[PDB]
């Protein structure tokens, strides 16, 4: 049991890409941007509660932010956590 207030903060956005699209069509895996301090257990709990789908497993990685220049002034985008959430077979988001 994680508190719902916590679960309502952990999922930030669906990650849109060719790889994410292929993940959903081939492997029944949604790709999410999640809070940087989100654990696999919290992401699982949140997806099952909020999307109302059975989660099989969560795989996670931290995307390191890119160094970029805006008018010859150097900056760095933020690191963010990606979750590959594999839904149980036949759940279908």
């Amino acid at each position: 049991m994680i508190r719902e207030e916590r679960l309502l903060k952990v999922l930030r956005a669906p990650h849109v890409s060719e790889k994410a699209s292929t993940a959903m069509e081939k492997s029944n895996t949604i790709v999410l941007k999640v809070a940087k301090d989100a654990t696999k257990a919290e992401i699982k709990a949140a997806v099952q509660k909020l999307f109302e789908v059975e989660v099989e497993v969560v795989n996670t990685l931290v995307v390191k932010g890119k160094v970029k220049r805006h008018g010859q002034r150097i900056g760095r985008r933020s690191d963010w956590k990606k979750a590959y959430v594999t839904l149980k077979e036949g759940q279908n988001l």
Binding site: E4, L8, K9, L11, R12, A13, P14, K33, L50
Partner: protein, 62 residues
């Protein structure tokens, strides 16, 4: 709006918090999907959450 929330109880404020957080989650998904046209609603719900949490702390006492 703090007028209205001040007249609610702790449990009434706690359900309003979860209602706003759920709306905040829904808006965040829409905005991420490129579906939210009304970008201003994100700030509104965020400040509403802050208002409810401020009053919850006032009810429990500083």
């Amino acid at each position: 709006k703090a007028k209205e929330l001040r007249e609610k109880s702790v449990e009434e404020l706690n359900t309003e918090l979860l209602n706003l957080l759920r709306e905040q989650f829904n808006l965040r998904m829409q905005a991420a999907s490129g579906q939210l046209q009304q970008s201003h609603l994100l700030k509104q719900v965020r400040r509403d959450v802050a208002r409810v949490k401020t009053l919850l702390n006032e009810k429990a006492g500083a």
